[PDB]
Amino acid sequence: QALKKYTIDLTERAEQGKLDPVIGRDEEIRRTIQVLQRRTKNNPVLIGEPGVGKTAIVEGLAQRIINGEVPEGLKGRRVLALDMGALVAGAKYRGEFEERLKGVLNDLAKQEGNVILFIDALHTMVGAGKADGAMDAGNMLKPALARGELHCVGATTLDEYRQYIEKDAALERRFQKVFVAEPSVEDTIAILRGLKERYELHHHVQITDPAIVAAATLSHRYIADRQLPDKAIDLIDEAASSIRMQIDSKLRNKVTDAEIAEVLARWTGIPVSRMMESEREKLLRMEQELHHRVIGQNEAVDAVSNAIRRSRAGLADPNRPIGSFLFLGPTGVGKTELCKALANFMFDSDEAMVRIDMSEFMEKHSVSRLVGAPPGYVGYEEGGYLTEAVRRRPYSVILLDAVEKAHPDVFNILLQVLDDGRLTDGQGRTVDFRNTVVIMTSNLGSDLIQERFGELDYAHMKELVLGVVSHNFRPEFINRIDEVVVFHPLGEQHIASIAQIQLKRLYKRLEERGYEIHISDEALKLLSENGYDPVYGARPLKRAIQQQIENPLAQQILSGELVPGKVIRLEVNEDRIVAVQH
Amino acid sequence: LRNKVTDAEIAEVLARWTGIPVSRMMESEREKLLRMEQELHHRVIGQNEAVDAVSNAIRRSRAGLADPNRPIGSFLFLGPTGVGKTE
Numbered sequence: 130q131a132l133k134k135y136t137i138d139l140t141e142r143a144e145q146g147k148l149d150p151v152i153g154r155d156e157e158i159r160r161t162i163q164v165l166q167r168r169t170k171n172n173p174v175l176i177g178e179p180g181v182g183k184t185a186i187v188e189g190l191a192q193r194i195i196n197g198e199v200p201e202g203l204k205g206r207r208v209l210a211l212d213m214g215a216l217v218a219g220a221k222y223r224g225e226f227e228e229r230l231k232g233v234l235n236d237l238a239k240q241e242g243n244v245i246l247f248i249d250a251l252h253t254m255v256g257a258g259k260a261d262g263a264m265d266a267g268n269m270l271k272p273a274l275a276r277g278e279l280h281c282v283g284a285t286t287l288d289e290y291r292q293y294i295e296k297d298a299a300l301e302r303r304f305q306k307v308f309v310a311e312p313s314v315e316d317t318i319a320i321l322r323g324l325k326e327r328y329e330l331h332h333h334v335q336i337t338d339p340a341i342v343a344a345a346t347l348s349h350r351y352i353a354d355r356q357l358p359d360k361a362i363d364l365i366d367e368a369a370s371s372i373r374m375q376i377d378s379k380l381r382n383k384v385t386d387a388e389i390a391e392v393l394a395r396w397t398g399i400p401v402s403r404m405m406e407s408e409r410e411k412l413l414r415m416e417q418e419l420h421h422r423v424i425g426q427n428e429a430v431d432a433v434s435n436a437i438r439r440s441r442a443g444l445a446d447p448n449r450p451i452g453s454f455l456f457l458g459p460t461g462v463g464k465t466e467l468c469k470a471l472a473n474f475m476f477d478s479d480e481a482m483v484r485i486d487m488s489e490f491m492e493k494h495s496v497s498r499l500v501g502a503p504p505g506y507v508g509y510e511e512g513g514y515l516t517e518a519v520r521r522r523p524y525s526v527i528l529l530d531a532v533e534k535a536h537p538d539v540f541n542i543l544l545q546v547l548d549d550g551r552l553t554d555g556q557g558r559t560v561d562f563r564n565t566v567v568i569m570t571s572n573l574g575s576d577l578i579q580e581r582f583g584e585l586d587y588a589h590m591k592e593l594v595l596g597v598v599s600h601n602f603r604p605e606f607i608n609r610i611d612e613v614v615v616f617h618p619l620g621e622q623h624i625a626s627i628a629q630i631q632l633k634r635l636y637k638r639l640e641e642r643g644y645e646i647h648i649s650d651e652a653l654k655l656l657s658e659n660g661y662d663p664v665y666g667a668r669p670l671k672r673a674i675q676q677q678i679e680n681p682l683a684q685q686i687l688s689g690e691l692v693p694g695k696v697i698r699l700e701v702n703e704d705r706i707v708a709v710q711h
Numbered sequence: 712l713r714n715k716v717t718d719a720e721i722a723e724v725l726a727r728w729t730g731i732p733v734s735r736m737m738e739s740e741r742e743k744l745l746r747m748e749q750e751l752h753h754r755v756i757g758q759n760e761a762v763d764a765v766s767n768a769i770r771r772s773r774a775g776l777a778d779p780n781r782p783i784g785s786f787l788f789l790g791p792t793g794v795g796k797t798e
């Protein structure tokens with residue numbers, strides 16, 4: 130009949146057992162039954178945020194009907210998953226949709242109060258038969274709803290509920306709101322323990338139950354895209370397919386929690402991966418790798434090494450971010466170099482990061498540049514720069530440079546940030562900063578540091594510059610810092626080592642060009658004499674390397690003088706540096 | 712345990728309807744509620760003033776003596792930086 134054409138019996142499928150076991154949801158199914166045994170407006174609607182198991186509530190109710198675990202008034206009923214695409218499709222003629230829907234309604238009256246109706250996507254039922262001068266499904270179902278003589282069950286997302294049903298109050302009051310919350314962690318672990326049998330029967334592999342509880346735990350903590358139980362189910366399924374292809378292509382036979390971590394790190398790259406000996410010996414050689422690019426300035430290397438080790442070691446403060454820092458020193462001591470060193474350690478690249486230089490924000494209102502603009506105003510549909518740049522890749526490094534340049538009340542934003550890792554952009558959603566490192570640099574007591582780094586300890590220098598910082602900032606803000614570090618002007622040996630590093634990357638780029646070039650150490654001594662001052666550090670070394678290398682060497686390369694394969698000693702002139710061809 | 716419909720039944724349905732706790736006090740909830748001053752001091756130690764104050768506020772809610780035109784808690788916490796206001 131017409132019920133055969135447009136409806137699908139879920140209860141016959143659960144009678145075949147071809148539906149999923151549904152475990153839990155007891156108050157939700159009980160209130161759904163309480164609404165379904167009424168006199169007027171029998172119709173519960175499963176308002177719940179997208180992917181918390183709303184279809185599975187009705188499927189589990191169908192299974193409880195088949196098992197006979199319902200009250201006596203529901204024993205022997207039929208749940209029919211109504212189809213909207215079956216009804217819209219065949220009707221470009223006038224009245225043909227209304228013909229079908231009225232025939233369905235007369236069949237449902239004919240079934241004598243035995244058919245439970247399930248309508249997935251109730252928001253699809255709203256704009257259903259919207260042809261020019263045509264009733265939708267609302268204008269035809271709406272009689273039989275509030276006489277109680279239809280046993281509809283809605284299932285809709287809450288954002289679809291606002292736009293598509295709360296806009297139409299008449300059909301909005303015909304139903305009964307059933308909030309279906311995202312489950313907490315422990316109950317989701319229980320549900321996943323229920324569903325282990327299905328995936329074991331599907332992929333013929335086994336699952337570690339610690340991997341299950343780790344998938345639920347890490348999914349609730351780190352992934353902010355989807356919602357429970359959906360994200361954890363997808364973790365388990367994708368791990369199962371990965372193990373199946375590891376076996377079948379070319380080891381193991383189960384699904385460990387390390388496989389869960391590999392799935393999560395493949396999905397984003399938050400380094401939940403366990404400390405393998407390459408990674409763990411890398412992490413124990415933290416300061417050694419930081420002094421592969423940054424000579425000197427030991428104490429901040431120590432502090433950030435400590436913070437990243439406490440992050441990776443499973444001792445993360447789960448609400449504050451990784452490290453809430455503050456760098457302080459005179460101009461040109463490689464503060465940005467240390468930040469690029471962290472980026473290169475973490476991501477194998479300097480500019481795989483976000484640097485936002487706060488000298489651009491010397492006015493107040495650029496707060497709205499990084500957090501966005503409210504509803505109504507100009508740049509609403511774009512988001513703040515900082516929030517979006519986190520919202521793509523949350524495991525990153527957020528760098529603020531020249532923090533003395535901006536207005537003091539930009540730093541209520543970072544009060545939020547360093548309190549909880551939370552930030553709310555102009556559209557009004559939270560952005561998790563629990564995988565970020567915040568570094569702020571200034572040159573506050575640079576006169577005081579250049580004056581008194583000699584003949585003083587590190588500690589009371591930090592004390593005195595902290596007093597200067599309290600003269601600068603707010604007591605709220607500097608409480609949020611994990612650790613304030615102090616930089617110092619470098620000796621000439623540090624600048625000679627930096628010149629060695631610049632010669633290393635120069636010879637790297639000239640082997641890329643294809644030239645075997647060496648240097649006299651006297652030329653290194655002359656370059657150390659040239660770009661040196663205690664007041665400015667190595668940016669004079671930058672310009673000295675720039676001029677006295679990049680001008681004559683590249684001038685003689687383009688002069689046809691430098692032949693590849695020749696030994697090229699960068700020896701000295703009387704006042705300059707000369708290359709040879711030997 | 713019942714055969715009729717009472718007003719506490721309506722309170723149970725209305726609490727399952729919106730969220731607001733209008734159901735009459737089961738003894739686990741009420742005995743948890745009396746210790747509210749004690750129960751806050753397992754995460755906020757010290758600052759007895761607003762702990763007792765807010766416990767008084769939520770007791771004014773659940774007992775039923777709230778102002779039915781004004782919200783329950785209308786507080787202004789004031790304290791130095793890091794003494795557990797947010798906590």
Ligand SMILES: Nc1ncnc2c1ncn2[C@@H]1O[C@H](COP(=O)(O)OP(=O)(O)OP(O)(O)=S)[C@@H](O)[C@H]1O
Binds near residue numbers: 149151154179362
């Ligand atoms: N209590 C539960 N017991 C067993 N499986 C569950 C339970 N809750 C959710 N699931 C599973 O979670 C997965 C997704 O739930 P679904 O109901 O299919 O998604 P959904 O509720 O339709 O969400 P939308 O609205 O389609 S985005 C399915 O594989 C369900 O089997």
Ligand SMILES: Nc1ncnc2c1ncn2[C@@H]1O[C@H](COP(=O)(O)OP(=O)(O)OP(O)(O)=S)[C@@H](O)[C@H]1O
Binds near residue numbers: 754757758797
């Ligand atoms: N009485 C307390 N009991 C327990 N933890 C406390 C207490 N007072 C402060 N804390 C700690 O305070 C930290 C956060 O305090 P907050 O309330 O955020 O600071 P605050 O009270 O908001 O002050 P400001 O000006 O906003 S920084 C948490 O990490 C708690 O551990």
Ligand SMILES: Nc1ncnc2c1ncn2[C@@H]1O[C@H](COP(=O)(O)OP(=O)(O)O)[C@@H](O)[C@H]1O
Binds near residue numbers: 423458467666
């Ligand atoms: N320890 C160091 N290691 C490597 N390069 C350095 C170091 N100190 C200074 N430099 C050079 O000096 C410059 C200092 O950069 P930056 O940290 O931006 O200076 P500032 O201290 O003003 O922030 C860098 O561009 C870099 O080339």
